[PDB]
Each structure stands twice: as C-alpha cells, then as structure tokens.
Design an enzyme around this catalytic site. Structure first.
Site, PDB file in Angstrom:
ATOM      1  N   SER A  72      43.984  45.454  17.471  1.00  0.00           N
ATOM      2  CA  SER A  72      44.389  45.198  18.721  1.00  0.00           C
ATOM      3  C   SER A  72      45.460  45.481  19.485  1.00  0.00           C
ATOM      4  O   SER A  72      46.587  45.678  19.646  1.00  0.00           O
ATOM      5  CB  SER A  72      45.651  43.790  18.696  1.00  0.00           C
ATOM      6  OG  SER A  72      45.945  42.872  19.654  1.00  0.00           O
ATOM      7  N   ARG A  73      45.669  46.430  20.430  1.00  0.00           N
ATOM      8  CA  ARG A  73      45.859  47.489  21.524  1.00  0.00           C
ATOM      9  C   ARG A  73      47.777  47.206  22.455  1.00  0.00           C
ATOM     10  O   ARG A  73      48.919  47.730  22.184  1.00  0.00           O
ATOM     11  CB  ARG A  73      45.042  48.300  21.686  1.00  0.00           C
ATOM     12  CG  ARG A  73      43.958  49.353  21.211  1.00  0.00           C
ATOM     13  CD  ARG A  73      43.106  49.719  22.715  1.00  0.00           C
ATOM     14  NE  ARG A  73      44.170  51.097  22.880  1.00  0.00           N
ATOM     15  CZ  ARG A  73      44.732  51.299  24.095  1.00  0.00           C
ATOM     16  NH1 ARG A  73      44.614  50.256  24.966  1.00  0.00           N
ATOM     17  NH2 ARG A  73      45.330  52.539  23.979  1.00  0.00           N
ATOM     18  N   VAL A  74      47.515  45.679  22.088  1.00  0.00           N
ATOM     19  CA  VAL A  74      48.400  45.067  22.726  1.00  0.00           C
ATOM     20  C   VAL A  74      49.644  44.335  21.059  1.00  0.00           C
ATOM     21  O   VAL A  74      50.840  43.665  21.911  1.00  0.00           O
ATOM     22  CB  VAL A  74      48.379  44.024  24.082  1.00  0.00           C
ATOM     23  CG1 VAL A  74      49.625  44.217  24.549  1.00  0.00           C
ATOM     24  CG2 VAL A  74      47.148  44.590  25.167  1.00  0.00           C
ATOM     25  N   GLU A 105      48.845  50.733  30.837  1.00  0.00           N
ATOM     26  CA  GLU A 105      49.250  51.771  30.261  1.00  0.00           C
ATOM     27  C   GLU A 105      49.777  52.485  31.220  1.00  0.00           C
ATOM     28  O   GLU A 105      51.331  52.547  30.841  1.00  0.00           O
ATOM     29  CB  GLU A 105      47.617  52.430  30.018  1.00  0.00           C
ATOM     30  CG  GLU A 105      47.292  51.849  28.168  1.00  0.00           C
ATOM     31  CD  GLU A 105      46.735  52.426  27.852  1.00  0.00           C
ATOM     32  OE1 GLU A 105      46.328  54.455  27.542  1.00  0.00           O
ATOM     33  OE2 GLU A 105      46.267  52.417  26.557  1.00  0.00           O
TER      34      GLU A 105
END
Lengths: 470, 56, 126, 126, 240
Positions: free
Chosen positions: D113-115, A193
């Site tokens: 799902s953060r991607v 990030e």
C-alpha cells in the site's frame, strides 16, 4: 496558403496543402474553429509535422484529444517549431508541454525571448578533456558512489524510502554550495505524486530555485513525447549564457520510449523484434547526447528507471543502461531500521571509483569498508539461529566494528530541521575519509553504539558521547 | 561403542551418496522441459512478428 | 605494402541494429528477431578480409579484435552465436569477478584459442 | 457535487479482449499477442479519473477497485504488468493459502500500500 | 439439438436433461472456417470472435420459471495445456467442474479426478451440512499438506521428517487410495460387479478414516473397494 483536413484516425491527422507551400518537418500547426450552429463543437489543437507524403499531403501527430474534428476544416501554418520561453522568468513556475503556465499567478508577456525545441548536439571540439568529480556533501555518495560532472546517474527505488527528501536535499546542497539551478521534468507519472512533491517543495521553500514541467499519464503520447525536450531546452539556457552547473531531473525515461512505440504503429512502419519502433536507438541517442559538459558550463542528470517484471533483457532497459555511469539503490530493510537516506552500500556502484581519479587512500578506505561490510553480511543466518555465542574472537570484532560503520554511514539533512530542530551539516570528502580511516583503525572502540547516529563530522561523536555521560 | 560409531559413520556416508545420485538424476529431467520451452518461445515470437508485418 | 596492422572494432551489435533499422525502413522482408536475411553475410564479408599473406605477395599481415556485448550474460542470442560460429576463439569476462575486484576478470574455463600453441615462444611454451 | 462515490470494476481482461476483437475486425495492425498498441492508454484514461478534489472544488472524492484475473498464478503476463504499473497498490490471493484453512487468503508479504499510514486512525497506527 | 430441447420446457414445462458430446469441436470448426472469410488471425490462430460466438450459444441454455434444464458437457484439452484460450474462456459459464489428470491416471487410480482443482457452488454449510463441510475441509487440508512435502521426500527420503509429518503422509496415502472406485461398465473387462455408495456412507467412512481407526491395515486394501466395510474383508482375505 492554408490546408484542409482529410483523414482522422485517432491521434493521427492528415493535412493537404497547396502545391509549392508544404511546411517543413517538425513545424507547428494550429487549428482554431468556432461552432457555426448547434451541431458543432469548438476546437483548439496543435499539430506537428512528421512525414511528407506524395500528393502534397502531410501526416501530423496530435498534441491533445481529436474528438469533434470534421473533415474539411482549416489549418494555419506557423512556420516554426514549438518555442518555449527561457530566462529568469521561468524560476518558481509550473509549465505544460507547450510552455503555458498552469498555476494561477498570471501569464508571461509575449515579448519574452523563446527558443526552438529541437537543436543539434555539441561538436567534438567543445567537450572537456578530463574527468571531474562533483561534490554533493553526502557521506555515502562521496565515499562509495562518486558523481562525475556531466554524467548520467540511475536511481532505483520504490515508495516510502525518502526519494523526495533526497532530491530536496540534493537541490538545496547544490544551490547553497555551487550556486546552480535545478530543473524538474515529470514524464508519465502519477498526478497525486506530482502534487505531493509540489506541495512538499512549497513547504520546504526550495521552489524558488526550481522550474517544473509536468506531462503526466493522462496526457496523449504526443504530449508525453516532448516533455523531456522542453525540460532540456529550458535547462540549456543557463549553461549556454551564465556558465553555471545545472541539475536535471527526469521522472521516468521508460515512458519516453513507450510513447514512441505506441505512436509508431499508426505511421505505417514495420514492427520490430518486441513490437517497438525501429528508431528506438536513434531516438534515445539524439536526446541523451545533449547532456554534456563544455568549457563554459556543465549539465548533469539524475534519472529514475523502472524495469517491468524485473526483466533486464528488455530492449528499452538494455538501450537505456548503455548511457549510465553510476547507480544508487534504496533498501526497504535499511529504511525500516531507522537509517537514512537508506542507500545500499553494496548494491550501488560507480565508474569513477578508481585509484587514478579519487586517490590511493580513498580507494583503499572504500575497499576496506566494502570488504568488512560484505564479511559482516554473511553471518546473518548463523547469528539469528545460533545466537552470538560459538563465534570466534575475530568474527566478534568484525561484527563489533560493522555496527559502528553502518551507524556512522547515516547523516542529518537541512530539510529535516522543520520536524526535529537539528540544523544539519555539510561534510567534506577529506573529513569523511579521515573519520572512516580512524574508525577502521579503531580509536573509538570504547564508545557507545548509539553515539554514531545522525552526527555528521567525526568530532561530534565525542561530544554526543560526553553528553550521554560516558 | 566403537563398533556403533563406525557403523554410524558408514551409514551417514551412504546416505549422502544416495542424495547426490538423486539430485543428479533430477537435473536432466529438468533440462528436457527447458529445451522444449526454449523452442516454444522462438516458434511463437517469429510467427507473431511475421503476422504483424503482413498486415500492411 | 608489407607491413603489419592491428584493427579493433568497438561494437558490432550496434552496427547490426542500425542495418536492421535501415532494412526495416526500406520495407524488406524480415527474419528472426526482425533481422534481414543477410546479416551473416554482412558480418562474414567484413571478418574474412584479415589474413597472413605469403612470401610472393609481400608477407604482410592484418589482425582484428571485434567486440560483442551481451545482456544478462547470455550467449545463446542470434548475433553472439553468429559471431562465435565465425571467429577462432573467444575471451570471457565475468561480471561477478569484476565486482569482486579482479582486473581483468578473465574466465579461463570458457576461453579457447584454436591457433594457440603455435603462436608462442619456446620459453613460454615450456 | 461534493458527495463520495465508490466504483467497482468486475473484469478488465474481458474488456481488453473485446477491444482487441474490435480492433482486429476494424483491420488495424496487431502488436504482441495480437493486442493493439494503445491498451496502456485505454486503461490509463479510465483509471486517471479517480481523485480527491480540493476545497475550492467542493471536496468531493472517488475511488475505484479494479479486478484482474491471472492464469496459473502467472504474475508476469502482459495485461497484469500493464495494470500493476498504474494503481497505488496490489492485493494478492493464493490458492495455496486458501486450501490451508487461511481464508481470506491475503498474502501479507507481497501486498503493498503506497498511500498507507496516512489512511489510518491513531488507535490503529499505535 | 438445443432448438429441439427448448420446445419441451417452453411449451410444456417438463423437466429436460441434456448431453453434449464434445463442445471444443464447435470452436475448432469455427476457427477452421474463419480463415477463408478474410479475418485476421488471433493470438494462437483462432478467430477474433471466439468469445462472443461461444457466449451466444452458452447463454441460451438456462432454466426459467416455465421449466428447468440440466446439462452435462465434455470439454477437450489440447496437448494437456489448461492455459489454451478455448478451455480458458469456457470456465466462466459453468457451476461445477471436474478435472482429470494423466499423472493420476498412470498410477492406476480411477476415475482419476483431481481433488484440489475441482470446485462447486453447492459446497456451503447451509446447503450440505456442517459435518460434511468439516470433513471435506479437513481432507483438502491434509491433501495439501501432503503435497507440500514432495520436494523434501523425493531427495532426502522419509527419515528426516518429524513425527507429525509421518502420520500425515500415512493418512494421506490411505485417503488417496480410498478415493478410487469401481464402476458397473468396467465389469465386462474385469469381472467385478461394481458398487453404488450413498453420501452418508462415504461421509461416515471418510470420518472414520480421518479418526485413525484403520491405521493398522495395508494400503493395498483400499483400492477399488467401494464401501468401508469391504476393506476389512479384503484385508482378511489377503491375510491380515
């Protein structure tokens, strides 16, 4: 006047000095060694003093890995705490905890001035005597959750909502309008990030007005402790010397207390109620009290807070919540609908929304907007199940105006121009208040619904409708 | 038809009253386990704190 | 000296936490929630100094309005229970009512005043 | 060296229990639930080694799929909460969906799902 | 006992069958002893070495190329808590497990085995059979669906349910009552001789019940009956 290493117990090292030459608390120490033979490893470490023991013994905290240490090594005393370079050189650069550059653009000359990390808080006489409102240029923030000059703002939200875009547009607007400087500090967050944010800043070009400090999850708790103080001492220079307005971003304050709780176990302190350190309140206060507005300048901070297991009775969230002044909540449902920045109009609250500060007209307009939105929200299940029919002539008008208000709550940003070709706009508080008052009155009930999407000022809605052929 | 309507209204009222009685019955059985868990949490946490303190 | 004084305490939970920190740093045996064994004594000693003197002593008076802050609206915590067991009443403020827009958000269903009734004028009492 | 590697960890709770046993045998002060204070550091050190290198480093990559077992479906336990705040997403399996004929019993409402999005082809994205 | 048992299958290759009365008392005695040895207490007062001590004993009971050993073990659950560390840490060593429930026991169902919690590694289509697998899956699905309606049933009654839910409950009650059985040991207390039921017979009976062939009989005729054919004679003796 040099010390010896006695005990190694992980991140804690004990050093013994000669009688009458003990270093002061918070002083920095250096360990430099070269392998004498094939059974040794080169070592380069930094230490800081934490406690004073009886027989000329000092207990320190390591800033990195302690592997390879050997009892009996030599320690050098610097005689001063950690110092970090300040000035215009730090603009557009990335630094570690110790202040060494991370990127490959070169090193900082050794003749630059540096300042100590630790510093007492400002006195009572130096503070301002009245409350002021910081203008940002965003309609939702300026209408429903105003920001005060010198307060603390808490931000709630997950991934994929546009937090980076919101941060970028806030920095751009502040730099364009007030000529300020923004500082970003990341504490115990994901390296992926961080890299993505850095690359996005490079692409957007806002990096030229920002200085970045990175202490991430892989770092030891000793390194994770000092990142916030390094960022704060970098930011304070512009307020103290140039008298500007400075933005300070902290990525996560929960890890700041978590690292201290992890560290305090090995120092020999008794445990607290939930296993935390007994000095949590003092540690939080000594850091939070340094962000204030004086007669020369002002510093305001936006902090992201993570609540573990959604338990608001946890001591760390309980202590952190006592310093906040306003909150902003991001909604995935609003994000999916296509509305940006997808700020929840009902969840977000602010302390400054009072008739004595913002004005009677502003207070009435905000109250009416909140009331009509709240009334609209209650009809969701009935509408979805039984259709739009069987509704009274009043609820139909309420839902007619609620859609217009909700669509007008959106805005277009400067940083989004590179993907759409729309320049963006900066909307004043008076203009947005007048537009919302006109909408509430109902002068635009005949306009199409889509004419209120991503316009900015109220007068652009008419032009968009005319372009649509109405 | 009138008689049927009256009987229907009476039956609906009786059913609603029975439902209220059942819910009021269930509440206290929930509260008992509430109290037991409340005691268990404290008796665990105090022992944990004392055991942690005694280590030094 | 025969005068009337009003004293307001902003927070007592923070004072209790500071005392707990000091006692823990001084290595004293802990109790429930790591608090020392004399927190109730510490609070009662402070709260017992407010009284209404008699005619012989001078007729002076002193009143106090201590404050307590709760987390998530619970009143079963150790310090709130200790303070409630000492005071003569309490006034409840509702977060939902404050969010609605009522100032003040006083909850009349839980507030009580043991001395009430004898401290009102005849018109208000009627 | 520029290759691509996939790593699967069978259990982390057992490793945490073994670490707790070792720490207790080494006479170190315990935390909550007798666990040591640096379990988060222990897990983060292991889980921070997976990354994708840049072009200057050869372009290698590595991915990990740790496993965590819960008791009676309790998702708020200490170890699960510590692990969840490190990875980039979660996949939930429920016995209620397992017994209703839905296998694999992946809960699509809670899985995150953060991607995602950038890890799909155009045909699947459309 | 284990060192007595190992010799036969190690030196003669003969089949050995083993019983253990209660394995929880071993860990309980270990926890009792560990306190005086100077070790720090664990989370719930157990010994720090609970896992390795049990693992050393459990890993010693295995079947090798020389011979095979089959074992049946009984495990005690303290205070009816399935999350206790001692019961929780022994689940990873077994292949088939059966669970007993006090709620089922109080209703008069014996041996009161929980049909949803019990699992086994042998329940595969290529090991047991397609028909058996389908019947078991259907029974489990019906039981789960019946379980999902308890909250509504307890408050609003059976009137508000649809046509399908009523039939689901009607067949689930019959299946649950038919799952019981009578044993030979209990004859000395009740006078009923007991029965022995083959796998094919019970599979056929469950399939016939699922097909809806016996929807007109009272539910009380399915208790402690054994084979399916005895249900009809019990019903006609009752008077249906």
């Amino acid at each position: 006047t040099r010390g010896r290493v006695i005990q190694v117990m992980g991140p804690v090292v004990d050093v013994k000095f000669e009688n009458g030459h003990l270093p002061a608390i918070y002083n920095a120490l250096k360990i430099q060694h070269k392998a004498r033979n094939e059974n040794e490893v080169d070592i380069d470490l930094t230490l800081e003093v934490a406690l004073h023991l009886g027989d000329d013994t000092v207990r320190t905290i390591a800033m990195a890995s302690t592997d390879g240490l050997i009892r009996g090594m030599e320690v050098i005393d610097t005689g001063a705490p950690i110092s970090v370079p300040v000035g215009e050189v730090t603009l557009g650069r990335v630094f570690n905890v110790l202040g060494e550059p991370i990127d490959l653009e070169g090193d900082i000359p050794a003749d630059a001035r540096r300042d100590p990390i630790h510093r007492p808080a400002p006195k009572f006489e130096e503070l301002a005597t009245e409350v002021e409102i910081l203008e940002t240029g965003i309609k939702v923030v300026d209408l429903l959750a105003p920001y005060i000059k010198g307060g603390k703002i808490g931000l709630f939200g997950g991934a994929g909502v546009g937090k980076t875009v919101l941060i970028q547009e806030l920095i751009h607007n502040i730099a364009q309008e007030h000529g300020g400087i923004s500082v970003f500090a990341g504490v115990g967050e994901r390296t992926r990030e961080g890299n993505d944010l850095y690359h996005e800043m490079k692409d957007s070009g806002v990096i030229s007005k920002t200085a970045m400090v990175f202490g991430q999850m892989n770092e030891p708790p000793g390194a994770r402790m000092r990142v916030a103080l390094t960022g704060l001492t970098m930011a304070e220079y512009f307020r103290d010397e140039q008298g500007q307005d400075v933005l300070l971003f902290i990525d996560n304050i929960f890890r700041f207390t978590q690292a201290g709780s992890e560290v305090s176990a090995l120092l020999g302190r008794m445990p607290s109620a939930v296993g935390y350190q007994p000095t949590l309140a003092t540690e939080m206060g000594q850091l939070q009290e340094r962000i204030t507005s004086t007669a020369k300048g002002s510093i305001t901070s936006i902090q992201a807070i993570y609540v573990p297991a959604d338990d608001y009775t946890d001591p760390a969230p309980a202590t952190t919540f006592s310093h906040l002044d306003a909150t902003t909540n991001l909604e995935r449902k609003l994000a999916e609908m296509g509305i940006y920045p997808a700020v929840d109009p009902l969840a977000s609250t602010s302390r400054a929304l009072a008739p004595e500060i913002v004005g009677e007209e502003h207070y009435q307009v905000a109250r009416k907007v909140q009331q009509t939105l709240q009334r609209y929200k209650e009809l969701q299940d009935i509408i979805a199940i039984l259709g739009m029919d069987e509704l009274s002539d009043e609820d139909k008008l309420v839902v007619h105006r609620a859609r217009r208000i909700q669509f007008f709550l959106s805005q277009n940003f400067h940083v989004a121009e590179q993907f759409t070709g729309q320049p963006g706009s900066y909307v004043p508080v008076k203009e947005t208040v007048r537009g919302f008052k006109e909408i509430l009155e109902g002068k635009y009930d005949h306009l199409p619904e889509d004419a209120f999407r991503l316009v900015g000022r109220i007068e652009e809605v008419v032009e968009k409708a005319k372009a649509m052929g109405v | 038809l009138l008689d049927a309507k009256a009987s229907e209204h009476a039956a609906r009222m009786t059913a609603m009253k029975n439902a209220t009685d059942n819910a009021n019955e269930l509440i206290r059985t929930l509260t008992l386990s509430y109290n037991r868990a409340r005691q268990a949490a404290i008796t665990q946490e105090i022992t944990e704190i004392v055991a942690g303190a005694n280590a030094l | 000296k025969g005068k009337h004084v009003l004293v307001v305490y902003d927070d007592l939970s923070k004072q209790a936490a500071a005392y707990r920190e000091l006692s823990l740093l001084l290595r004293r045996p802990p109790g429930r929630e790591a608090y020392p064994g004399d927190i109730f004594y510490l609070h009662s000693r402070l709260l017992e100094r407010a009284a209404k003197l008699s005619d012989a002593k001078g007729g002076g008076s002193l009143t106090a309005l201590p404050f307590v802050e709760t987390q998530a609206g619970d009143i079963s915590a150790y310090i709130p229970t200790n303070v409630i067991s000492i005071t003569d009443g309490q006034i409840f403020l509702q977060s939902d009512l404050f969010f609605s827009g009522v100032r003040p958000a006083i909850n009349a269903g839980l507030s009580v005043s043991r001395v009430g009734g004898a401290a009102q004028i005849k018109a208000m009492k009627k």
